[PDB]
Each structure stands twice: as structure tokens, then as C-alpha cells.
Homo-oligomer: A and B are copies of this chain.
Amino acid sequence: PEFGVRDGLYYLTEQQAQAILDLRLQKLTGLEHEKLLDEYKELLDQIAE
């Protein structure tokens, strides 16, 4: 419970930090933000199912 959103502040884990460092410059474009939003919504629907 230490990590995650707390008081409007996201606390990263070491795995999350490593995933962020693996992020490529290709994915800073405007399309990939919408891709992440859509993928997160789809995964929330899948988790609910």
C-alpha cells in the first residue's frame, strides 16, 4: 500500500522506474498518449469481466 496514488501523488516502484527508463523517444508523440489511454480503458474493462 505504500506505492500508488496517495494524496494526489503517484509513488513509483523500482519496476515502474525501470519501465520508464526503457521508454523510447518514438513514444513521446501525441498518438501514443491516446494509445495508452485506450489500452488502459480496455484493460479496466477486461479486469471487470
Contact = CB atoms under 8 A, between A and B. Distances in A.
Interface string A19-33: 011111110000000
Interface residues of A, number: 7
B21 A23 contact: no
| Residue from A22, A23, A25 with most neighbouring chain B CB atoms (10 Å) | A25
A12 to B, nearest CB: 14
Contacts of A20: 25
Contacts of A26: 21-22
Interface of A: 20-26
Given A21-B24, A22-B25, 6 more contacts: A21-B26, A22-B24, A22-B26, A23-B24, A24-B25, A25-B25
